[PDB]
Design an enzyme around this catalytic site. Structure first.
Site, PDB file in Angstrom:
ATOM      1  N   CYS A  56       1.483  24.679   1.160  1.00  0.00           N
ATOM      2  CA  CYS A  56       0.649  24.721   2.446  1.00  0.00           C
ATOM      3  C   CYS A  56       0.408  23.183   2.978  1.00  0.00           C
ATOM      4  CB  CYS A  56      -0.853  25.268   1.995  1.00  0.00           C
ATOM      5  SG  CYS A  56      -1.675  24.314   0.565  1.00  0.00           S
TER       6      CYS A  56
ATOM      7  N   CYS B   1       0.235  19.204  -1.365  1.00  0.00           N
ATOM      8  CA  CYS B   1       0.868  20.492  -1.782  1.00  0.00           C
ATOM      9  C   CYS B   1       2.236  20.477  -0.812  1.00  0.00           C
ATOM     10  CB  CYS B   1       0.188  21.638  -1.377  1.00  0.00           C
ATOM     11  SG  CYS B   1       1.069  23.209  -1.666  1.00  0.00           S
TER      12      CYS B   1
ATOM     13  N   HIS C 129       4.403   4.784   5.369  1.00  0.00           N
ATOM     14  CA  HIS C 129       5.172   5.534   4.400  1.00  0.00           C
ATOM     15  C   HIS C 129       4.192   6.207   3.344  1.00  0.00           C
ATOM     16  CE1 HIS C 129       8.772   2.276   4.670  1.00  0.00           C
ATOM     17  NE2 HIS C 129       8.511   3.034   5.724  1.00  0.00           N
TER      18      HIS C 129
HETATM   19  N1  LIG Z   1       5.070 -13.620  -2.973  1.00  0.00           N
HETATM   20  C1  LIG Z   1       5.547 -13.090  -1.800  1.00  0.00           C
HETATM   21  N2  LIG Z   1       5.388 -13.315  -0.611  1.00  0.00           N
HETATM   22  C2  LIG Z   1       5.802 -12.601   0.694  1.00  0.00           C
HETATM   23  N3  LIG Z   1       6.999 -12.020   0.414  1.00  0.00           N
HETATM   24  C3  LIG Z   1       7.568 -12.059  -1.004  1.00  0.00           C
HETATM   25  C4  LIG Z   1       6.977 -12.123  -2.089  1.00  0.00           C
HETATM   26  N4  LIG Z   1       7.602 -12.004  -2.964  1.00  0.00           N
HETATM   27  C5  LIG Z   1       8.753 -11.234  -2.512  1.00  0.00           C
HETATM   28  N5  LIG Z   1       8.963 -11.187  -1.130  1.00  0.00           N
HETATM   29  C6  LIG Z   1       9.807 -10.639  -0.368  1.00  0.00           C
HETATM   30  O1  LIG Z   1       9.334  -9.264   0.096  1.00  0.00           O
HETATM   31  C7  LIG Z   1      10.552  -8.671   0.358  1.00  0.00           C
HETATM   32  C8  LIG Z   1      10.510  -7.128  -0.172  1.00  0.00           C
HETATM   33  O2  LIG Z   1      11.490  -6.434   0.277  1.00  0.00           O
HETATM   34  P1  LIG Z   1      11.200  -4.772  -0.349  1.00  0.00           P
HETATM   35  O3  LIG Z   1      11.369  -4.902  -2.072  1.00  0.00           O
HETATM   36  O4  LIG Z   1      12.717  -4.058   0.216  1.00  0.00           O
HETATM   37  O5  LIG Z   1      10.015  -4.234  -0.021  1.00  0.00           O
HETATM   38  P2  LIG Z   1       9.667  -3.329   1.456  1.00  0.00           P
HETATM   39  O6  LIG Z   1      10.655  -4.250   2.733  1.00  0.00           O
HETATM   40  O7  LIG Z   1       8.338  -3.296   2.009  1.00  0.00           O
HETATM   41  O8  LIG Z   1      10.437  -1.987   1.449  1.00  0.00           O
HETATM   42  C9  LIG Z   1      10.542  -1.106   2.375  1.00  0.00           C
HETATM   43  C10 LIG Z   1      10.676   0.280   1.916  1.00  0.00           C
HETATM   44  O9  LIG Z   1      11.688   0.515   1.066  1.00  0.00           O
HETATM   45  C11 LIG Z   1      11.174   0.956  -0.062  1.00  0.00           C
HETATM   46  O10 LIG Z   1      11.996   2.047  -0.357  1.00  0.00           O
HETATM   47  C12 LIG Z   1       9.971   1.714   0.333  1.00  0.00           C
HETATM   48  O11 LIG Z   1       9.665   2.917   0.838  1.00  0.00           O
HETATM   49  C13 LIG Z   1       9.479   0.440   1.083  1.00  0.00           C
HETATM   50  O12 LIG Z   1       8.159   0.776   1.637  1.00  0.00           O
HETATM   51  C14 LIG Z   1      11.590  -9.291   0.023  1.00  0.00           C
HETATM   52  O13 LIG Z   1      12.263  -9.464   1.327  1.00  0.00           O
HETATM   53  C15 LIG Z   1      11.071 -10.351  -0.776  1.00  0.00           C
HETATM   54  O14 LIG Z   1      11.477 -11.566  -0.600  1.00  0.00           O
HETATM   55 ZN   LIG Z   2      -0.819  24.652  -1.749  1.00  0.00          ZN
END
Ligand SMILES: Nc1ncnc2c1ncn2[C@@H]1O[C@H](COP(=O)(O)OP(=O)(O)OC[C@H]2O[C@H](O)[C@H](O)[C@@H]2O)[C@@H](O)[C@H]1O
Ligand SMILES: [Zn+2]
Length: 249
Positions: free
Chosen positions: A127, A124, A116
């Protein structure tokens, strides 16, 4: 943390990992979903999509500049350190992350794929040109491209945008040859990232999930460890390192 799990890891032929925001939570960086998740406090519809950026680039930039500062000033945690060590030991072959922070890199991880994008990158809108920053810009004024007189934007992938083809293809190739995949700190809802672990399972590999919550991936995870990544990974890598050190060679 049974002998079966340790064996699966220590004896793996091509182990890879997929990490999410949860792996950086212990660094003082909030996640996106759940309790105090960013998407629960802020609206993604006004911050994480091309339409929102075009409508109010100042508001979007002020928010990302804040996130950048937060990440740049944070330190890698035990989980980041553990993944780097698992790679140093020659076990972890590639680390695929959905995270836009650079904590995996600052912990020493070398082969990292950023599905991501990254908060370190700015590019930019006109470009095809980008570069990395050492610290967060001050907003206003709006960061401008010194290559064509247009606006710069955070080098991250927003909702509705296509992940760079080369990046996803590389990640796809990694999971196509992996016999084991550690899936840590991700809610397993965002696509296409959430589909990567399925490839490993479909081709005959094992999935090791590390998350305090159950997710849509839990039902097919060979192992699902309910705990924080820092604690679980630190213990897991220490045991794997010990196991490897015991080998008569
Ligand atoms: N200490 C921890 N250790 C391991 N997992 C944890 C911890 N604390 C929280 N979590 C877990 O992390 C997870 C995070 O989920 P998201 O907040 O949805 O993060 P992610 O899966 O990486 O998101 C995916 C994508 O969506 C976002 O919009 C963005 O682009 C991102 O990369 C949850 O399931 C949660 O339970
Ligand atoms: Zn540019």
């Amino acid at each position: 943390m049974d002998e079966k799990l340790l064996k699966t890891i220590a004896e793996s032929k091509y182990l890879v990992a997929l990490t999410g925001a949860g792996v950086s939570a212990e660094s003082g960086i909030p996640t996106f979903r759940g309790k105090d998740g960013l998407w629960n406090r802020y609206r993604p519809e006004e911050l994480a999509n091309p339409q929102a950026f075009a409508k109010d680039p100042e508001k979007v930039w002020k928010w990302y500049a804040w996130r950048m500062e937060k990440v740049f000033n944070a330190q890698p945690n035990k989980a980041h350190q553990a993944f780097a060590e698992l790679e140093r030991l020659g076990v972890l072959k590639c680390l695929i992350t959905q995270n836009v922070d650079d904590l995996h890199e600052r912990a020493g991880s070398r082969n990292v794929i950023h599905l991501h994008g990254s908060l370190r990158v700015v590019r930019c809108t006109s470009c095809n040109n980008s570069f990395e920053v050492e610290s967060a810009p001050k907003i206003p004024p709006l960061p401008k491209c010194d290559k064509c007189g247009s606006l710069l934007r955070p080098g991250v992938v927003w909702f509705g945008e296509m992940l760079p083809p080369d990046v996803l293809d590389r990640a796809m190739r990694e999971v196509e040859r992996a016999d084991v995949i550690i899936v840590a700190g991700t809610s397993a809802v965002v696509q296409p990232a959430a589909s990567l672990p399925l490839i490993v399972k479909q081709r005959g590999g094992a999935i090791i999930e590390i998350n305090p919550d159950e997710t849509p991936l839990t039902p097919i995870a060979d192992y699902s460890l309910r705990g924080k990544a820092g604690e679980v990974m630190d213990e897991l890598v220490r045991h794997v390192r010990k196991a490897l050190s015991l080998k008569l060679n």
